[PDB]
Ligand binder design. Structure first.
Ligand SMILES: *CC(=O)CC[C@@H](C)[C@H]1CC[C@H]2[C@@H]3CC[C@@H]4C[C@H](OS(=O)(=O)O)CC[C@]4(C)[C@H]3CC[C@]12C
Ligand SMILES: *CC(=O)CC[C@@H](C)[C@H]1CC[C@H]2[C@@H]3CC[C@@H]4C[C@H](OS(=O)(=O)O)CC[C@]4(C)[C@H]3CC[C@]12C
Ligand SMILES: [Cl-]
Ligand SMILES: [Mg+2]
Ligand SMILES: [Mg+2]
Ligand SMILES: [Mg+2]
Ligand SMILES: [Mg+2]
Ligand SMILES: [Mg+2]
Lengths: 320, 318
């Protein structure tokens, strides 16, 4: 999985991710309205302050989000981090104790900006408290973004780490500081076109575009996707329309997507981009496409009872 | 630009390509029917033996195809090759003199298999004879495919050469022999998952998938796209349904596509994948999407009069 955060220069947030896996999870768009009665193990989510829309599943009358955005312009995505993620084994008195499964719900239902959730994270403990035993307990890290900036949250054996994500991307393991340092191994990667190099007495001109992009890796490994996504995302020109910004998400994530046959997991099955999802605060809409159909589908929070009392598992969508 | 050829194991051909450029060409789906009166400068295309569908433009009531397939399951795509392409400046008496602009029309309108066009190519001179003065004269090479195999045609200062394209892909410069030899620089690239390496006394486990794909380049340079496409295309599992094979084309070509900002041309403008097109002989349908809209659209040849007398520039599509 790879996630990205960006804006349009006019205060609107776009946060998008690939869900890469060897099978699909049965996920749907889920709306969590402001009147929903929460089921928060340690009271971190006492009520829904901001309505939430995103992709996930419902278990135990609880929304389990893979990624989601709220009606105040804040969004979050959870990505796999096994080997590094290690949550607290118990809640701590006085802390804001957040069960891992509800961490995205906590971010999006409680806060309206990265400043606010960053301030709240000063007291957070993320607890290994599974929703139930139907899936292996999660081992995740998260990217959180608003129109201004992104942060990355990693909870490991030495506790909570919050990073300034100044490249606005996230992939999988290892930890964020490792990937950020690794960017320093690609300082000669550039989109620029050189007209002529002389090497010794050889006049060398490019075959075409991309001659100084050489070195950006094309493989599916997590550190490689981080570098490749950081390059493509940094260099994509800012856009001012909803349509060009939707197109930016899907093109950028297609550059780090996984297709059949190219990389196996230990099972021997091939990892593939099962869906690509985008939250837009400008239109309070969740957009997505899937491995089987690249056409973009969408769900607008304005079409659903976001002031209602029940989780809405959305069955109808626009533009396909 | 990158092109691919594959089949479904049941005799059906899929040939697809990205059109990468700094601007849109205004291309449309063009059907050339068997009753169309040709405008072939040296008589290479005297009549349309097989109806053709593909993406291109029409000038002087002549279909100028970027890529196309015919009603017998043969298809062809033209990709940029400047610096290397060098056509004949005049027609050669006694040869099959094919104007470069009509080369894809010649392949698709005259022949029913790669065997047939390969035999005909022994006689061919490709001539620099522009359609008109509007565009710079083309400098191209081509991939030609049927359900059995692909060949690459390059016409250079060494003349016409036909290559056995046993990796079923094509990109831009340099020549096909160069790229084919370059494949030998990526022999350790693999999709396999290794459980555990020991380096000296360090136990090394993958972070996740892709640990042995390291080395496959991710940049937009032509040789890099050739290697990356050759890897993805070689390892994509064969599929037996139309839906899965359509999906295979668009996913494979998204792996080598170009998006805004990542690689500039000399002008300083960014090269982008403007459209991705696929010809399917199973359904005699041309499928495509565009930079602005990833939804797949399609035109079926059967919805147009394949034995009519006029070029059809399609507007109504799925
Ligand atoms: C490519 C990747 O990074 C893969 C991530 C993918 C497998 C994850 C991302 C979000 C996860 C779900 C989050 C919500 C719940 C959490 C449950 O944990 S528990 O409470 O400890 O039991 C596990 C199930 C589920 C649905 C996660 C499943 C794995 C994810 C889809
Ligand atoms: C990424 C790439 O490889 C880009 C290739 C792109 C620029 C080419 C591919 C097909 C070309 C057109 C083919 C048909 C005609 C041929 C004319 O040649 S002429 O008769 O010598 O004048 C030039 C115009 C046109 C439409 C070509 C334009 C360039 C291409 C779209
Ligand atoms: Cl093995
Ligand atoms: Mg699915
Ligand atoms: Mg080129
Ligand atoms: Mg266009
Ligand atoms: Mg005549
Ligand atoms: Mg007939």
């Amino acid at each position: 999985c790879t996630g990205i955060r960006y804006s349009d220069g006019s205060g609107n947030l776009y946060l998008a991710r690939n869900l890469d896996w060897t099978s699909d999870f049965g996920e749907r768009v889920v709306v969590t309205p402001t009147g929903y009665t929460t089921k928060s193990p340690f009271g971190a989510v006492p009520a829904i302050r901001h309505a939430v829309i995103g992709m996930g599943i419902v278990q135990e009358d609880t929304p389990l989000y893979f990624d989601c955005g709220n009606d105040a312009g804040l969004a979050v995505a959870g990505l796999n981090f096994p080997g590094y993620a290690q949550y607290a084994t118990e809640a701590v008195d006085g802390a804001t104790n957040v069960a891992a499964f509800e961490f995205p719900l906590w971010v999006a239902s409680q806060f309206a900006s990265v400043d606010e959730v960053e301030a709240a994270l000063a007291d957070v403990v993320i607890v290994d408290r599974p929703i139930n035993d139907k899936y292996p307990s999660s081992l995740l890290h998260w990217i959180i973004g608003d129109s201004k900036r992104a942060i990355v949250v990693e909870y490991t054996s030495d506790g909570l780490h919050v990073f300034d994500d100044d490249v606005d991307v996230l992939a999988n393991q290892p930890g964020f500081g490792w990937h950020h340092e690794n960017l320093r191994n690609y300082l000669n990667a550039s989109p620029d076109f050189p007209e002529k190099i002389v090497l010794n007495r050889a006049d060398l001109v490019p075959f075409g575009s991309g001659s100084l992009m050489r070195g950006i890796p094309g493989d599916y490994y997590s550190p490689s996707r981080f570098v490749r996504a950081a390059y493509v995302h940094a260099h994509y020109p800012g856009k001012s329309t909803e349509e060009e910004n939707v197109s930016r998400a899907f093109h950028t994530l297609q550059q780090v997507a996984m297709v059949d046959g190219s990389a196996a997991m230990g099972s021997g099955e091939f990892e593939k981009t099962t869906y690509t999802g985008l939250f837009s605060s400008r239109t309070m809409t969740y957009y997505w496409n899937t491995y089987e159909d690249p056409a973009v589908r969408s769900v607008a929070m304005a079409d659903h009872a976001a002031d209602g009392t029940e989780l809405v598992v959305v069955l109808e969508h626009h533009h396909h």
